């Protein structure tokens with residue numbers, strides 16, 4: 039960011055003005071610029087800048103993680119969270135994956151919210167893990183969540199306890215949704231069981247109004263929302279699940295995910311839901327571990 | 342219908358709109374709040390203040406159904 | 415945690431100036447004073463004051479709490495038992511309901527019936543709220559609502575003595591025709607711009623009128639299917655209007671009724687995702703059928719309803 | 729170091745070492761990351777198996793690296809799969825997460841310390857350079873210099889990193905904008921000058937992928953067909 043006191047120990051405000059005087063205002067400005075020239079120009083000690091460069095790099099630059107360390111860590115950290123639909127967990131290779139943004143693309147009434155609730159209901163009860171359902175279309179209905187939990191468990195209290203773990207937060211504009219994810223990300227950083235599943239229903243609901251016209255700010259907000267989802271998923275190790283609308287291609291005339299081509303690179307795993315009343319087809323439109331094209335029947339009434 | 346000069350917007354704001362071929366309430370409203378943040382400058386909840394201000398000049402007058410029955414008598 | 419300045423609803427002119435000055439996260443600007451922010455970024459004092467205000471400003475109700483909210487905030491009954499059963503009890507609050515159908519099927523009759531049904535007192539199972547009628551096709555007939563209101567009063571007074579209790583009859587001391595009509599807010603939107611303008615002024619309108627428990631947009635098809643040939647613009651306006659309606663219903667705790675015209679429902683494919691609840695009113699051998707095309711709480715099903723002079727009944 | 733044709737003979741049929749920067753382009757699901765895993769596999773697998781046994785740095789700016797997928801590819805390519813061997817093979821793999829262009833830029837400067845201590849680190853992955861394009865473009869306003877200011881500084885740092893330690897940069901970019909071989913360049917001209925072989929990934933509609941590679945020095949186009957199975961990438 040901007041060179042200021044408290045950004046690094048030993049960084050006095052007196053020299054910060056001196057660095058500004060040579061058009062060095064940012065962290066990348068100080069690191070990139072030749073410090074030997076600045077040390078002579080500003081009168082600042084060269085050993086100080088070299089020490090100042092190292093501490094700034096050690097604070098703002100990500101550090102490489104060895105694959106062996108990451109493999110052992112992800113072995114006991116990543117969790118395959120069952121969606122409660124045995125005919126879909128087979129498609130997802132035993133279910134959802136933490137650390138990935140899973141997208142559930144489909145048309146209206148294709149079961150996108152319904153499968154998301156089952157993911158929320160199963161994680162809330164079966165795995166006893168809290169869920170943050172960020173609904174933008176108003177899809178979540180607490181009666182349906184109770185109805186899903188009633189089928190799984192007949193205990194009066196366990197249904198309420200599972201519902202207690204599902205945190206429903208309503209965000210209908212992009213900035214509200216960005217605020218919720220950032221507020222959640224701060225909550226996880228400051229920590230009682232934390233949030234393990236984040237369900238966004240739907241991303242296309244808030245991003246589609248942004249898209250349109252010569253402005254590219256909608257794409258930036260989309261990618262910033264995409265960045266927030268992936269920071270929640272990969273950094274915080276929670277199974278982020280998002281919901282997307284379906285659209286027909288202008289040229290090829292085939293079903294593709296909405297929010298343009300830029301959003302198509304966002305999710306690690308994508309599930310396509312299309313009607314073949316409750317039977318649906320779940321086609322793995324995008325996967326990082328399984329072939330794309332496999333489709334399995336998914337019935338809503340079995341859940 | 343109504344121009345944006347008579348809505349209540351400032352000369353600086355109207356001129357910034359006039360550079361982008363926006364002169365009526367219809368053109369202003371058709372643009373999404375996000376794309377107005379660059380055409381009109383300003384920020385979200387500041388454009389919405391305009392979006393509420395431009396709407397306040399081209400929105401229907403509330404009529405209580407008792408008044409409609411009363412005016413029909 | 416560092417929050418990118420793009421994620422904030424800042425002015426794009428200001429955000430570029432902030433980035434060009436090196437500020438790229440929210441936490442950088444928090445320590446900066448407003449006037450000193452202007453010196454270091456070049457933005458005006460008002461913009462700097464608004465920029466810091468936006469960053470500093472930026473509920474989490476559990477599903478159990480929302481279950482009690484949905485139970486306490488009752489569904490808006492449609493005066494038809496079959497239709498209410500396949501909707502959980504009626505039109506759900508904090509949600510958007512779409513009434514799709516061919517012309518002449520009774521989309522506006524349901525809306526005008528729902529306007530009276532909102533004003534049913536809480537002690538009678540209603541929400542005891544008020545109705546906002548954003549009419550577009552000009553189908554809002556006051557005389558028909560009077561018949562709907564009077565018939566609703568007669569039905570409520572028939573249930574007001576089978577229980578042999580005056581405790582309910584206290585609630586029916588204000589349900590007179592005077593209050594029913596005086597609580598129906600009618601907005602005759604002619605063009606889509608006027609309709610879109612009223613949607614923006616609705617959050618401010620409902621802040622003043624907290625009693626409003628129903629917003630009726632009858633219909634969202636006519637303004638956007640007349641005097642608008644740009645389909646690319648239409649799908650942007652409807653998608654933008656979709657978030658305005660659902661946010662309005664959830665924040666103000668009311669129900670939004672949208673009526674389409676069958677073309678499958680019109681207004682494009684992306685409009686199917688707009689409304690959480692979709693009801694398709696069609697015809698079958700001169701008998702009206704109500705099909706639940708899309709709902710996250712009820713399975714797809716069809717129920718029989720008849721539009722009698724008494725109102726929207728089974 | 730090792731020749732490019734010594735890394736993957738199929739793509740680099742001709743003789744084409746010591747500072748080559750290559751670009752992967754194409755839509756989603758077209759095998760860009762899966763090709764990196766094959767490139768990662770042939771570098772981090774032992775010389776006994778058939779790999780080059782050299783270290784690989786992955787800059788996952790897109791937050792899409794699936795470690796279990798790489799383990800799945802690595803164990804299939806190993807004749808004798810074991811927890812010890814998969815550990816040693818991944819011991820030569822390094823992963824860095826960059827959440828923003830400035831974070832990526834500051835990371836690249838900090839990488840100078842690692843390469844001076846990791847001589848065997850030969851292959852560099854930057855999937856994907858197009859992750860922060862829209863964030864940087866809007867933050868830059870209408871001035872093209874401001875939009876590409878952070879990316880250009882990364883590219884100059886990349887060129888310094890590649891040409892100092894004889895690296896091979898397999899930076900990948902996404903086809904995020906429509907057609908003008910569907911390729912519409914959108915990154916800074918500083919990055920464009922560094923690309924020597926840009927390879928376009930396309931998906932045939934099921935499991936067969938086509939890869940068109942062009943050497944910008946000679947402008948020679950050759951089409952490669954590969955299938956993505958459980959073992960990774962196999963060329964047809």
Ligand SMILES: Nc1ncnc2c1ncn2[C@@H]1O[C@H](COP(=O)(O)OP(=O)(O)NP(=O)(O)O)[C@@H](O)[C@H]1O
Pocket residue numbers: 144145146147148149150151152153175177182185240281315316338339686687688689690706707708709710711712713714
């Ligand atoms: N309790 C239930 N039992 C059986 N089927 C149900 C139930 N609730 C909903 N459904 C089915 O679920 C369908 C809609 O599911 P839903 O998940 O809302 O689709 P969707 O893709 O999310 N629509 P959208 O809100 O635009 O995303 C309905 O049409 C019903 O067929």
Ligand SMILES: Nc1ncnc2c1ncn2[C@@H]1O[C@H](COP(=O)(O)OP(=O)(O)NP(=O)(O)O)[C@@H](O)[C@H]1O
Pocket residue numbers: 302303304324325326327328329330755756757758759760761762763792902929956957958
């Ligand atoms: N085990 C597997 N067996 C067969 N095919 C697979 C397997 N794992 C992945 N695939 C396929 O390999 C394709 C390539 O994936 P991937 O390399 O992530 O695409 P991509 O170009 O990187 N899209 P992006 O993430 O935006 O870069 C996927 O789309 C799958 O269809």
Ligand SMILES: Nc1ncnc2c1ncn2[C@@H]1O[C@H](COP(=O)(O)OP(=O)(O)O)[C@@H](O)[C@H]1O
Pocket residue numbers: 516517518519520521522523553721722723
């Ligand atoms: N008083 C009444 N008696 C009998 N039928 C009525 C009465 N009022 C309305 N209807 C029926 O209800 C339908 C109203 O449809 P409506 O939704 O209001 O118009 P549109 O479908 O064009 O929007 C009409 O087709 C009419 O047959």
Ligand SMILES: [Mg+2]
Pocket residue numbers: 150151152175177239710
């Ligand atoms: Mg939904």
Ligand SMILES: [Mg+2]
Pocket residue numbers: 760761762792
């Ligand atoms: Mg990839």
